[PDB]
C-alpha cells in the first residue's frame, strides 16, 4: 500500500495511525533497510508529492538516522555503514536531487542529509559532498529554495557530526559559505540560513581562519549583515559575532575600533528586546573571557613566565558608555514580574555584576550619582533601580572603600524596607541579605541591628517571594555572627553572643515559617532548614538549653517522618517526600555535631530505630538513601566505642548497602562508612571483617562499575589493616596481587580528567600501602614478624613510584602521600631499603620539591621522609 | 546561554545543597583521617 499514504497519515491528528505508521516504518527498516530507505528517498525526491508527506518522510528518516540518545545514534551509524554502496549512492543522489523541489521554508531533507553523512564521513564513503554543495552554491541558475535547502543541510552537518571527521574538508565548505554570503543575494532567507550554518560550523574554521584576507572578507561580510534591515538577520549575525568573540579573542584588537563597538552599542540602544539582549550577551562574554585572561595573567605573574594571551582592558575602556545605558535599561521592569522567563532587566543586572567584578573599583564614581538621586523617587521604578544597583555593585572594590557609603546609607535602606510596594521590598530584602553576606562588619551594628532584625522578623511572615530572601538573609546573619563571634567570645566555643541573646526568639519562628502551607513556593521548605542548620550551628554555650529544646522538637518531625508511608500518591509527592528526607537526615548530623555525648546517648536508641526502618521503606529512589548511611555514620563519629550494641542489627544492612553494584554514589559513602567503623570499632570489627572483605573483592572483580570508585576501595584497604593489626595475614597475599595489576596499569597523556583520575588512583595506592605497613608493624613494639610477608614486593613498589616520579602532572597530595611510603618502609625495614632506594636517583629530586611544596601536610611528610634516611645512613 | 544561575538567589537548588553537604563531609572525613594518621605516626 502507498507509503505516501503512510506519510500523510503520520501527520494527521490520530494516535492510532501515528503508532501504526511508526511500527510499520521500524519493522520495515529493520527487516529491509536498503530497499525501504531507497523507496523513502525516491518518494521524497518527487516534487509532485504533497509537502506534508515529504516533511513526514524527512522527519522519519531523521528519526531512523539520528536520535537524542548517543548510543542509539552510534549503533544506527554502525547499522547504516553496513548497507551496500550501490543503494548508498542511490539514496545519496535521491536526497541530493530532493532539495530545491520543496515549497516548505525549512528543508526536511536537511535532517536526512545530516543523518546519512553522520556515518558517511567517518568511513569517507561520500567524498563528493563538498564539491557537490560548492557547485550548488556557485550555480547562477540556483533558485531560493535550492540555496536555502543546501545551507540548512550544511548547518545540520556542521552541527551534529563529530568535528574531527570534517577536519580535512573544511576549506571548500568555508569557501562555499563565504561565496554564498554575498550581500547581493535578494532573499534574506539565504543570508539567515548561511549565518546559522557558519555559526554552527565555527568549531573547525581554523583551517581558513589564519589568512588575513579571508578573515577580513568574512568579517566585512558579517558586518554588512549586521546592517541588514531584517531583524532576524540582525540577531543571527550578532550571535555569530558573539561566538567569534568567544573563540578568537587574540586578534579582535585589530578590529575593535572600526566597527565592532559601534554596532554593539547600537544594538544595546535598540528598543527591541532581542537586539539589546544580544548586545548584553556579547559584552558579558567579553567580560568573562577578560576574567579568564586575568586569571591566566595572574598565574603567569606568580610563575614569572609571560602569559600566552594578553588582555587590553576592553571593558575598562567601554564602561563610560556602558554604565548609563545599562542603568537606564535596568528600569524596564514590569508590574507582573516573573522569574521563569529571562528578560533584558535581569540580563542587565547580571551584566552589571560582571562588569563590577571586572573593573574592580572603577565603577563607583560612574554609578553613585544615579543611585544617590533615585533612591528616594516617589515612583517605585527608580527606587528599585537605585536599590538593585546598590546591591549589585556591592562587590569588586575592597570593603574599606565601601564602608562609609554603606554605613551612611543603612538607615535609608531600612527605611525602604517598609514601603508598601512589594517589588521594592523584595529587592531591599535581597540587598540587605547580600550586604550581610559580603561585608559583615557593617551588618553588626547595635545602633541598627535591633530595628532591622525586628523588621525582617515580621517581614518573614509576608509572601514567599520575600520570605525565601529574608530566610537566606537570616542565614547570612548567622554565619556573620559566627565569624565575628569566634573572634569576640572565646575560641574553643562561643559562650554568649549579641545575636544569640535573641536566639530563642528567631529559632521558633523559623519553625513557624517551616510549617507555612506555601513552603513549596520559592523553595521555602528548603529555605528554613538550610538556614536552620547554620543558626543551630551558632549555639553559644548559653544557647545550649535552647538547642536542646529544638532538638526535643526535631525528632517529632522524624517521628512524623515515620507515619506517612501510605500517603505517597504522586511522583511530585514522592519527590517532595524524597526532598524532605534529605534535609531532615542532614538536620540531625547538623545538630548531633554540637551536642553532648551524654545527651546523645538517650536519643541514640530512638535515632537508630528511625534510621533502621527508613533504609528499607524507600527501596527505590536510592538518591535519598545515599544521604542515609553517612547520617548513620555521623552517629559513629560521636557515639564511638558505645556503638557496638547495634552491629548485630547492622551487618545485613551493610551487606544490602553494598549489594547495589549499580550506583557508585551509594558505595562511595559505604566504603567510607566501613572506613569510619575502623577508627571507632578498632579491633572489634575482626569477626565482621571476614564477610565484608570477601564482599570487597567481589566489587573489585566486577569491572562494570565506574573508574572513580576504584581508588576508594584502596582507601579502605589501608586503614582496616590498622584496625585489625596483624590479623590481615589471611587476606594479605590477595591484596598485593590485586594491587599489582592496578599499580601496573598505565595510560597515555591525552585527557586531563583521566590524568587526574590516575592521580587519585595512584594516591589511593600509596595510602593503602602505608596502611598495611602500619597495621603489621604494631603501635609501640619493634617491627613485628608480620611484615616479612610483604618484603619481596617492596622493590616493585619502589619501581611503581619511580614511574610516578617520572610523571609530569603532579599535585600536592600525590607527592605528600608518596613521602609516606619511604618513612614507613624505612621504619619497617631500615637497612633493607637503603640500598633499594639508592638504585633510583629521581627520588632525590622528588623530595627537593617536597621541601618546596607549600602544603603543610606535604612539608611534614617531606621532612618526615628525608630525616629518616639520615639516621639510617649514620646507623652503620 | 541560560546564565540565570547568577541572578537573584536562584543559585540555591537542592542538587547544589546536596553537593555542598557531601563536599563538606569529605573535607571533614579527610581532616579526621590525616589527623589520626599524624598523631599515630609522629609529631
UniProtKB/Swiss-Prot annotation, chain A:
PROSITE patterns per the UniProt record, alphabetical: HEAT_REPEAT, IMPORTIN_B_NT
N6-acetyllysine carried by residues: 211, 835, 867
Main localization of the protein described in the UniProt heading: cytoplasm
Modification sites for Phosphoserine: 12
HEAT repeats: 2-31, 33-65, 85-123, 129-160, 170-202, 212-247, 253-302, 314-360, 364-394, 402-438, 449-485, 500-537, 544-592, 600-639, 644-681, 686-724, 732-776, 786-829, 831-873
InterPro entries noted in UniProt: ARM-like, ARM-type_fold, Armadillo, HEAT_type_2, Importin-beta_N, Importin_beta
Any single Pfam family the record assigns to this protein: HEAT_EZ
Protein name (database record): Importin subunit beta-1
Organism expressing this protein natively: Homo sapiens
Curated annotation (Swiss-Prot), chain B:
Disordered: region residues: 1-17
Modifications the protein undergoes after translation, according to the UniProt entry: Ubiquitinated. Deubiquitinated by USP22; leading to stabilization and increased activity.
Residues in IBB domain copies: 1-43
Subcellular location: Cytoplasm; Nucleus; Endoplasmic reticulum membrane; Golgi apparatus membrane
Motif Nuclear localization signal location, chain numbering: 35-43
Tissue specificity field: Expressed ubiquitously.
Homology family: Belongs to the importin alpha family.
Its job: Functions in nuclear protein import as an adapter protein for nuclear receptor KPNB1. Binds specifically and directly to substrates containing either a simple or bipartite NLS motif. Docking of the importin/substrate complex to the nuclear pore complex (NPC) is mediated by KPNB1 through binding to nucleoporin FxFG repeats and the complex is subsequently translocated through the pore by an energy requiring, Ran-dependent mechanism.
Subunit comment: Heterodimer; with KPNB1. Interacts with ANP32E. Component of a complex containing CSE1L, RAN and KPNA2. Interacts directly with CSE1L. Interacts with PLAG1. Interacts with APEX1 (via N-terminus). Interacts with FRG1 (via N-terminus). Interacts with ARL4A, CTNNBL1 and NBN. Interacts with SNAI1 (via zinc fingers) and SNAI2 (via zinc fingers). Interacts with BAG6. Interacts with AIFM2; this interaction likely mediates the translocation of AIFM2 into the nucleus upon oxidative stress. Interacts with RSL1D1. (Microbial infection) Interacts with HIV-1 Vpr.
UniProt note: domains: Consists of an N-terminal hydrophilic region, a hydrophobic central region composed of 10 repeats, and a short hydrophilic C-terminus. The N-terminal hydrophilic region contains the importin beta binding domain (IBB domain), which is sufficient for binding importin beta and essential for nuclear protein import. The IBB domain is thought to act as an intrasteric autoregulatory sequence by interacting with the internal autoinhibitory NLS. Binding of KPNB1 probably overlaps the internal NLS and contributes to a high affinity for cytoplasmic NLS-containing cargo substrates. After dissociation of the importin/substrate complex in the nucleus the internal autohibitory NLS contributes to a low affinity for nuclear NLS-containing proteins.
Protein name per UniProt: Importin subunit alpha-1
Amino acid at each position: 500500500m502507498e507509503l505516501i499514504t503512510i506519510l500523510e497519515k503520520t501527520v494527521s491528528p490520530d494516535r492510532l495511525e501515528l503508532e501504526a505508521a511508526q511500527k510499520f516504518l521500524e519493522r520495515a527498516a529493520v527487516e529491509n533497510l536498503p530497499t525501504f530507505l531507497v523507496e523513502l528517498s525516491r518518494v521524497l525526491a518527487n516534487p509532485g508529492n504533497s509537502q506534508v508527506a515529504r516533511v513526514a518522510a524527512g522527519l522519519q528518516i531523521k528519526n531512523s538516522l539520528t536520535s537524542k540518545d548517543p548510543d542509539i545514534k552510534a549503533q544506527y551509524q554502525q547499522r547504516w555503514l553496513a548497507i551496500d554502496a550501490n543503494a548508498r549512492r542511490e539514496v545519496k543522489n535521491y536526497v541530493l536531487q530532493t532539495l530545491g523541489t520543496e515549497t516548505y521554508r525549512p528543508s526536511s531533507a536537511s535532517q536526512c542529509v545530516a543523518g546519512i553523512a553522520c556515518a558517511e564521513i567517518p568511513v569517507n564513503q561520500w567524498p563528493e559532498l563538498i564539491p557537490q554543495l560548492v557547485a550548488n552554491v556557485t550555480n547562477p541558475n540556483s533558485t531560493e529554495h535550492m540555496k536555502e535547502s543546501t545551507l540548512e543541510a550544511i548547518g545540520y552537518i556542521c552541527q551534529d557530526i563529530d568535528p574531527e571527521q570534517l577536519q580535512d574538508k573544511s576549506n571548500e565548505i568555508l569557501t562555499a559559505i563565504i561565496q554564498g554570503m554575498r550581500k547581493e543575494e535578494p532573499s534574506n532567507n539565504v543570508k539567515l540560513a548561511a549565518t546559522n550554518a557558519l555559526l554552527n560550523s565555527l568549531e573547525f574554521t581554523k583551517a581558513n581562519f589564519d589568512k588575513e584576507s579571508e578573515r577580513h572578507f568574512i568579517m566585512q561580510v558579517v558586518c554588512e549583515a549586521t546592517q541588514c534591515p531584517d531583524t532576524r538577520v540582525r540577531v543571527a549575525a550578532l550571535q555569530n559575532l558573539v561566538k567569534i568573540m568567544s573563540l578568537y579573542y587574540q586578534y579582535m584588537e585589530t578590529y575593535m575600533g572600526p566597527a565592532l563597538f559601534a554596532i554593539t552599542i547600537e544594538a544595546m540602544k535598540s528598543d527591541i528586546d532581542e537586539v539589546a539582549l544580544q548586545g548584553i550577551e556579547f559584552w558579558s562574554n567579553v567580560c568573562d573571557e577578560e576574567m579568564d585572561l586575568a586569571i591566566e595573567a595572574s598565574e603567569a605573574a606568580e610563575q614569572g613566565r609571560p602569559p600566552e594571551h594578553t588582555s587590553k582592558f576592553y571593558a575598562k575602556g567601554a564602561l563610560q558608555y556602558l554604565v548609563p545605558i545599562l542603568t537606564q535599561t535596568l528600569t524596564k521592569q514590569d508590574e507582573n514580574d516573573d522569574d521563569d522567563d529571562w528578560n533584558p532587566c535581569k540580563a542587565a543586572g547580571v551584566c552589571l555584576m560582571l562588569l563590577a567584578t571586572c573593573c574592580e573599583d572603577d565603577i563607583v564614581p560612574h554609578v553613585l550619582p544615579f543611585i544617590k538621586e533615585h533612591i528616594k523617587n516617589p515612583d517605585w521604578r527608580y527606587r528599585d533601580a537605585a536599590v538593585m544597583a546598590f546591591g549589585c555593585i556591592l562587590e569588586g572594590p575592597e570593603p574599606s572603600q565601601l564602608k562609609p557609603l554603606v554605613i551612611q546609607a543603612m538607615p535609608t535602606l531600612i527605611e525602604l524596607m517598609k514601603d508598601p510596594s512589594v517589588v521594592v521590598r523584595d529587592t531591599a530584602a535581597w540587598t540587605v541579605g547580600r550586604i550581610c553576606e559580603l561585608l559583615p562588619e557593617a551588618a553588626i551594628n547595635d545602633v541598627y541591628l535591633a530595628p532591622l532584625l525586628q523588621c525582617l522578623i515580621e517581614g518573614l511572615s509576608a509572601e514567599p517571594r520575600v520570605a525565601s530572601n529574608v530566610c537566606w538573609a537570616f542565614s547570612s546573619l548567622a554565619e556573620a555572627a559566627y565569624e565575628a563571634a569566634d573572634v569576640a567570645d572565646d575560641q574553643e566555643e562561643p559562650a554568649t553572643y549579641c545575636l544569640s541573646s535573641s536566639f530563642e526568639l528567631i529559632v521558633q519562628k523559623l519553625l513557624e515559617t517551616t510549617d507555612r502551607p506555601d513552603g513549596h513556593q520559592n523553595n521555602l521548605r528548603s529555605s528554613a532548614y538550610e538556614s536552620l542548620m547554620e543558626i543551630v550551628k551558632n549555639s553559644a554555650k548559653d544557647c545550649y538549653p535552647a538547642v536542646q529544646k529544638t532538638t526535643l522538637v526535631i525528632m517529632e518531625r522524624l517521628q512524623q517522618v515515620l507515619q506517612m508511608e501510605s500517603h505517597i500518591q504522586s511522583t511530585s509527592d514522592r519527590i517532595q517526600f524524597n526532598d524532605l528526607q534529605s534535609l531532615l537526615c542532614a538536620t540531625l548530623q547538623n545538630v548531633l555535631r554540637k551536642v553532648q555525648h551524654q545527651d546523645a546517648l538517650q536519643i541514640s536508641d530512638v535515632v537508630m530505630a528511625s534510621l533502621l526502618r527508613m533504609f528499607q521503606s524507600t527501596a527505590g529512589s536510592g538518591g535519598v538513601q545515599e544521604d542515609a548511611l553517612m547520617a548513620v555514620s555521623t552517629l559513629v563519629e560521636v557515639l564511638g566505642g558505645e556503638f557496638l550494641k547495634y552491629m548485630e542489627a547492622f551487618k545485613p544492612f551493610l551487606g544490602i548497602g553494598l549489594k547495589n553494584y549499580a550506583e557508585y554514589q551509594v558505595c562511595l559513602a559505604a566504603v567510607g562508612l566501613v572506613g569510619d567503623l575502623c577508627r571507632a570499632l578498632q579491633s572489634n570489627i575482626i569477626p565482621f571483617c571476614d564477610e565484608v572483605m570477601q564482599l570487597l573483592l567481589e566489587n573489585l572483580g566486577n569491572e562494570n562499575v565506574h573508574r572513580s570508585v576504584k581508588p576508594q576501595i584502596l582507601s579502605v584497604f589501608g586503614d582496616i589493616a590498622l584496625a585489625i593489626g596483624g590479623e590481615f595475614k589471611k587476606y594479605l597475599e590477595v591484596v598485593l596481587n590485586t594491587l599489582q595489576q592496578a599499580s601496573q596499569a598505565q595510560v597515555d597523556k591525552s585527557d586531563y580528567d583521566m590524568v587526574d583520575y590516575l592521580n587519585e588512583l595512584r594516591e589511593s595506592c600509596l595510602e593503602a600501602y602505608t596502611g598495611i605497613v602500619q597495621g603489621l608493624k604494631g603501635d609501640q613494639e619493634n617491627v613485628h614478624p608480620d611484615v616479612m610477608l610483604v618484603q619481596p614486593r617492596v622493590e616493585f613498589i619502589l619501581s611503581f613510584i619511580d614511574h610516578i616520579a617520572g610523571d609530569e602532572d603532579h599535585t600536592d597530595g600525590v607527592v605528600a602521600c608518596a613521602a609516606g611510603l619511604i618513612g614507613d618502609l624505612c621504619t619497617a625495614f631500615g637497612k633493607d631499603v637503603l640500598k633499594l632506594v639508592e638504585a633510583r636517583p629521581m627520588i632525590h629530586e622528588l623530595l627537593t620539591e617536597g621541601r618546596r611544596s607549600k602544603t603543610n601536610k606535604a612539608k611534614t611528610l617531606a621532612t618526615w621522609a628525608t630525616k629518616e634516611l639520615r639516621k639510617l645512613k649514620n646507623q652503620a | 546561554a541560560a546564565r540565570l544561575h547568577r541572578f537573584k538567589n536562584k543559585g540555591k537548588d537542592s542538587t547544589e545543597m546536596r553537593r555542598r553537604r557531601i563536599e563538606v563531609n569529605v573535607e571533614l572525613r579527610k581532616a579526621k583521617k590525616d589527623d589520626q594518621m599524624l598523631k599515630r605516626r609522629n609529631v
